[PDB]
Ligand code: NA
């Protein structure tokens with residue numbers, strides 16, 4: 073099997089509109105969470121969100137936008153960034169050896185709702201002729217594959233919170249097995265009340281911190297009370313190692329493990345044992361120690377703990393366990409985009425030799441007092457190998473391990 | 480790479496609620512298309528659909544239904560059928576070597592719309608706490624993986640019309656490469672105005688035949704005027720050959736090729752060249768001649784022809800070209816479910832030694848007069864190798880080739 077490296081990254085996040093902004097946010101523990109006035113207007117319990125702040129119209133032209141939902145527009149931007157970062161020629165983007173696996177946890181629910189509304193108010197024709205590609209689950213791959221003239225693999229993987237971890241992992245497999253030499257992998261999610269309300273109604277999102285929105289997402293805090301939803305996108309450019317080397321690519325890291333498992337247990341809550349198997353699977357092909365864990369931890373009572381127990385089972389507790397820092401405390405949970413975004417945060421931490429604070433831990437949950445949850449940014453750390461989990465609704469688990477490329 | 484066989488099938492279709500019903504419909508060219516009175520009420524141009532006729536509540540119990548949309552409920556039924564057909568024990572369904580890749584072209588758009596409506600009418604709490612797994616793009620995998628206690632791979636691939644062809648192909652790869660020994664693969668789609676309207680608004684669905692709904696889907700007819708949307712589901716049980724043999728499995732066929740490519744051209748229209756590359760890729764691992772092509776052909780002016788030209792390029796014209804019979808003329812286009820359903824129709828035709836009529840060709844389009852489009856059911860034919868295309872919006876292409884297992 074071939075080796076596979078990350079040669080470019082692009083990101084639209086609640087904590088920044090490019091990798092530089094994101095890095096600064098990570099370094100300074102700058103929360104991307106703000107009040108969602110619309111959620112309050114609609115009567116939600118949760119009135120916070122992680123909203124990107126980026127001018128789509130300035131970055132994606134009108135014809136390009138014809139078939140985009142906002143999530144995929146953000147993914148388009150991320151794709152442009154990743155292509156630029158990678159320094160790819162048009163030929164390198166568009167060829168039979170280059171594919172795309174790009175997913176979202178949902179499609180444009182706003183398109184779906186707006187279309188239903190307008191059908192009933194003004195008639196079906198007034199939906200307009202461009203809604204299908206926005207509304208379909210493959211929207212992220214369909215739109216980008218078409219616009220970027222992708223000729224290889226083209227589909228979306230969806231797996232809720234794990235979506236873009238699976239997208240990356242499957243793309244990794246594609247290249248490992250020699251089916252593609254380059255892949256664009258990642259995912260996106262719109263941020264819209266029509267999606268967020270589904271989570272609010274299940275009581276899944278934080279509401280106790282509406283008056284201090286910036287600190288609402290607080291993985292491992294004793295008083296965490298649900299996740300904070302976000303939107304955005306991320307893209308990695310993946311290449312087989314020879315391809316990367318031959319063109320003098322940047323190498324942000326090497327993908328060295330990928331785990332994917334299923335809990336087969338509960339729709340909304342993790343089992344824990346699935347995560348253990350997922351991490352073990354990811355680690356089964358990894359020879360070096362893990363220097364940092366980017367957990368799934370979404371700031372939920374029921375979610376943060378079983379993952380920590382899974383980590384304890386694999387890695388132990390205290391100093392021997394890799395440092396753990398939950399980036400969702402800063403970023404919220406962007407569902408389809410989370411996996412790739414977390415890969416990017418981890419690769420940026422690797423690049424910049426620091427591990428961010430696991431933010432907003434005002435009082436650590438005592439259940440986690442034995443674990444190396446990062447309470448203050450760690451500087452001057454040589455990260456060589458980083459592990460990132462995403463454990464999604466439906467008991468779907470994906471773990472990725474990235475390594476600093478040193479030959 | 481390991482060999483991979485189909486050991487069980489389940490299906491919920493506009494042309495039958497199980498494989499026996501489906502086989503009878505195929506044999507007798509019994510259309511599954513009917514008038515959609517609701518579409519007329521809503522002012523659609525297209526007033527036809529392919530609706531399953533199956534009593535969900537009698538087949539999936541209430542607790543089981545908690546997190547199902549209708550599409551995934553149909554997929555649940557199909558999964559139950561496939562498990563029964565395969566004769567799997569509970570242990571064989573639920574184990575670390577057994578996974579699920581099950582997708583839909585969209586999620587429950589009805590859940591999304593109903594939730595938005597009720598949020599605005601009665602408040603967000605009244606969405607209820609069970610909407611996320613119905614609304615998310617991974618709904619088909621999440622629901623089934625959880626209910627069936629799947630422990631291996633668990634995610635959805637979405638690729639519009641190609642969805643469940645990719646699901647099957649990726650599951651095939653999983654087993655080929657030794658990652659899983661058994662996979663449940665397939666997909667589903669609800670049939671609901673909230674999805675169908677998106678296609679009506681783009682003028683994609685047939686409207687000239689509303690007065691004769693049964694014949695509205697008419698691939699290759701000169702006067703075809705758009706596809707007919709359908710809902711349903713299908714599941715294949717895939718196993719590595721040794722696993723299948725060792726347990727005395729039924730073998731419906733062997734998956735012997737899988738192509739996946741991207742047009743990188745137009746969002747709604749096929750390029751043709753992508754399909755050629757897709758079929759070639761599928762055929763690259765196939766040693767026997769193709770005895771039957773189950774085309775993508777959805778009964779559209781712009782769609783049916785480029786695929787025929789692609790077929791002509793690979794296979795030639797006339798007698799030397801494999802017989803082509805568009806099952807969507809009977810079934811309509813069930814989007815996420817189409818690929819797996821067409822695999823099942825093809826495997827059932829293989830099992831039963833006939834090729835169905837390519838239905839509703841009242842006047843063949845003269846552009847296709849050179850091609851072996853099946854005008855009357857062909858009986859007493861030994862099908863050993865069958866090819867099925869699905870070429871979806873966003874220029875996403877998937878082709879599968881199945882072979883009669885003879886050692
Ligand atoms: Na993570």
Ligand code: NA
Pocket residue numbers: 773774775821866867868869
């Ligand atoms: Na087909």
